[PDB]
Design a protein around this ligand. Structure first.
Ligand SMILES: CSc1ccccc1CN(CCN(CC(=O)O)Cc1cccc(O)c1O)CC(=O)O
Ligand SMILES: [Cl-]
Ligand SMILES: [Cl-]
Ligand SMILES: [Cl-]
Ligand SMILES: [Cl-]
Ligand SMILES: [Cl-]
Ligand SMILES: [Fe+3]
Length: 498
C-alpha cells in the first residue's frame, strides 16, 4: 504494498544532473534536489534550505542564513560552502542559462561561514527569489559528486537533499525512486515509486486500464482526452482536472510574409472558432483563451479586448488589405502572391495534428491557405530557434514562470518568441521595457511596464491564443485525492497519502 506506487513517464528521468536540461526530466530533478526557498501557490516563497535572509538597501546584496541540520542523502553536510560550490558549478556554464535572467544577474556567490551565504547581483532583480525556487538550475548536489570540480561535464551519483532518492534506472524501461529515510523534513507516506517508460498516450491509458500502473499525472497530452472523459464516468477509477495552469497558442511570424502584415495577423485571430476547436479536438476539456496570459495571471488583468470568432470580420480585414479572391478560386491573392501560410508542428503528436487540421480548415473558410508541415521534434525546435516558420504551436510556462520569465525569454534570439516578434517596429522598445520591468521596485511602474508590453503584444497580434490548459490526473481510487504542486512542472509525490 500500500506504500508503493507505480506510474508512467514517456522517457527515463535522465542522469538527474541538477544543473542541466535535456534529457533530464524536471519533475525528477525536483524530487531529488531542493532550492534555498520554496515557491507557494499564492506567489510567495517560503524558507527552505535557507531559514532566513536579508538584503542590502540597494537590493543587490543578499545574505542567506542556511539550516544547519541538513544532510545530503549520502550523509555529507549541506552548508554554505556546498551551496556556494553549486552556484559556481552552474555559473561556470553561464552561457547555457541565458534564458534565465538571474543567471546573468549573479555577479558573486560566497560562503561567509558554514551557515551564511552571500549572493551579489548586478541590479535589484525583483524575481530573484522566485527564480531561486525553480526546479533548475539553482538546486544542490553534493559537491563530492562533481566531476573534476564541475557539473557541466557530468556528475557522479545524483545525490541531493530531497525526500526522494533515485534507486535505479533501466534505459527505455523504468526508473525507481525510494523515500529518503534521512530527509531533514517531513517523511513521505509513500516508500517507493516506479516510473514505467511509456511514450504512447494510448498505451499509457491501456496500462492504467489493465492495472499495470496506479497513477497518471500530466497536462493535456497525458492520455487521449476522449478516454479521459470515459474514465471520469467510470466508478472503478478516479480522475481530476485542475484549474488552468498555462496558455497554448500559435506564434505568428511578424518577420515573414504574409504574417508580417498586421491586417493578416488580425484576420487570423478572428478566423478560428476556439470553442469548437476545444470541443472537437480536445473533447471539451479545456478553456478558451483570448489573450497571451489568462486574466488571473499576475500583472495580466488588463482588460485586453478579445477577438471573437468572426469570419465576416476576418474576410473584411483581408479585403481591405488587398487580399481578394481571384475568379473561381478560394484562396486570396495580393500582388500575384497567394495568401499561403506554413504551420509547423511535431508530426507524431496526434493532438497537435488534430488541432492543426482544424486551424487549416477554419482559415480556409476565410481564404487563407494553411500548409501543414509536420516534422520530427528536432526539426521543429530548429525552426523555432532560427525563425523558419509562418505559424507554430507554442505555450507559456505556468507558475512561477508566467509572466516574468516567459517575457524575459522573449529577448533571447534562440527562442521562438524573439523570432516571432522580429518584424515589429517596436521590438527594441519591448525588449528594453522587459529589461526594465524585471529590475523595477516601483510597483506602479512595474504594473505600467507589464501593461505596455502585454498590450503591445496583444495589439500587434503576435499570438493566436487558443486555450488555457489544465493538469489532469487518472488514479486508482485507493490513492485518494491527488494534490497539485504550486510549480506546474513538479509532481507532489510527497503529499500523496494512499
Ligand atoms: C532547448 S533545452 C535548453 C537548452 C539550453 C538552455 C535551456 C534549455 C531548456 N529550456 C529552458 C526554459 N524552460 C525551463 C527549463 O527547461 O528549465 C522553460 C520551461 C518552462 C516550463 C516548463 C517547461 O517544460 C519548460 O521547458 C529551453 C526551452 O524550454 O525553451
Ligand atoms: Cl543541457
Ligand atoms: Cl526532454
Ligand atoms: Cl516572497
Ligand atoms: Cl562557521
Ligand atoms: Cl573527478
Ligand atoms: Fe525548458
Amino acid at each position: 504494498a500500500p506504500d508503493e506506487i507505480t506510474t508512467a513517464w514517456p522517457v527515463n528521468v535522465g542522469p538527474l544532473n541538477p544543473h542541466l536540461y535535456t534529457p533530464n526530466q524536471m519533475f525528477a530533478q525536483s524530487m531529488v534536489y531542493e532550492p534555498l526557498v520554496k515557491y507557494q501557490a499564492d506567489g510567495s516563497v517560503i524558507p527552505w534550505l535557507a531559514k532566513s535572509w536579508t538584503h542590502s538597501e540597494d537590493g543587490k546584496t543578499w545574505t542567506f542564513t542556511l539550516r544547519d541540520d541538513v544532510k545530503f542523502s549520502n550523509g555529507e553536510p549541506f552548508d554554505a560552502e556546498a551551496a556556494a560550490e553549486n552556484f559556481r558549478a552552474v555559473l561556470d556554464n553561464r552561457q547555457r542559462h541565458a534564458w534565465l535572467e538571474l543567471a546573468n544577474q549573479i555577479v558573486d556567490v560566497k560562503a561567509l561561514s558554514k551557515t551564511e551565504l552571500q549572493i551579489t547581483l548586478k541590479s535589484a532583480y525583483y524575481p530573484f527569489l522566485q527564480e531561486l525556487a525553480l526546479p533548475r538550475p539553482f538546486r544542490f548536489i553534493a559537491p563530492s559528486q562533481f566531476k573534476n570540480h564541475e557539473t557541466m561535464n557530468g556528475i557522479k551519483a545524483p545525490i541531493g537533499t530531497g525526500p526522494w532518492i533515485l534507486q535505479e534506472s533501466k534505459l527505455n524501461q523504468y526508473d525507481v525512486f525510494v523515500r529518503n529515510e534521512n530527509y531533514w523534513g517531513e517523511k513521505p507516506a509513500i516508500k517507493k515509486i516506479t516510473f514505467n517508460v511509456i511514450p504512447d498516450p494510448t498505451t499509457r491509458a491501456v496500462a492504467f486500464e489493465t492495472g499495470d500502473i496506479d497513477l497518471l499525472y500530466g497536462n493535456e497530452g497525458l492520455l487521449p482526452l476522449d478516454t479521459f472523459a470515459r474514465f471520469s464516468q467510470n466508478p472503478a477509477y478516479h480522475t481530476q482536472l485542475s484549474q488552468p495552469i498555462e496558455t497554448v497558442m500559435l506564434a505568428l511570424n511578424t518577420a515573414k510574409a504574409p504574417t508580417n502584415e498586421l491586417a493578416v495577423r488580425e484576420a487570423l485571430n478572428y478566423a478560428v472558432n476556439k470553442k469548437s476547436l476545444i470541443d472537437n479536438a480536445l473533447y471539451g476539456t479545456q478553456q478558451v483563451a483570448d489573450t497571451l496570459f489568462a486574466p488571473s495571471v499576475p500583472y495580466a488583468n488588463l482588460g485586453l479586448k478579445p477577438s471573437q470568432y468572426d469570419p465576416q470580420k476576418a474576410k473584411a480585414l483581408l479585403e481591405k488589405a488587398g487580399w481578394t479572391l481571384p475568379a473561381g478560386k478560394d484562396i486570396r491573392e495580393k500582388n500575384g502572391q497567394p495568401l499561403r501560410i506554413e504551420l509547423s508542428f511535431i508530426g507524431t503528436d496526434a493532438l497537435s495534428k488534430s488541432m492543426a487540421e482544424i486551424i487549416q480548415a477554419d482559415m480556409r473558410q476565410i481564404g487563407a491557405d494553411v500548409s501543414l508541415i509536420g516534422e520530427e521534434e528536432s526539426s521543429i525546435y530548429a525552426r523555432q530557434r532560427d525563425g523558419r516558420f509562418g505559424m507554430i504551436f507554442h505555450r507559456t510556462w505556468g507558475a512561477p514562470y508566467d509572466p516574468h520569465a516567459f517575457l524575459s525569454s522573449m529577448r533571447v534570439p534562440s527562442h521562438a518568441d524573439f523570432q516571432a516578434q522580429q518584424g515589429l517596429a517596436d521590438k527594441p522598445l519591448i525588449d528594453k521595457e522587459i529589461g526594465e520591468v524585471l529590475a523595477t521596485h516601483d510597483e506602479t511602474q512595474r504594473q505600467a511596464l507589464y501593461r505596455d508590453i502585454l498590450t503591445r503584444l496583444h495589439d500587434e497580434a503576435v499570438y493566436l491564443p487558443i486555450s488555457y490548459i489544465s493538469m489532469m490526473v487518472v488514479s486508482k481510487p485507493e490513492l485518494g485525492n491527488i494534490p497539485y504542486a504550486p510549480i506546474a512542472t513538479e509532481i507532489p509525490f510527497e503529499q500523496i497519502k494512499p
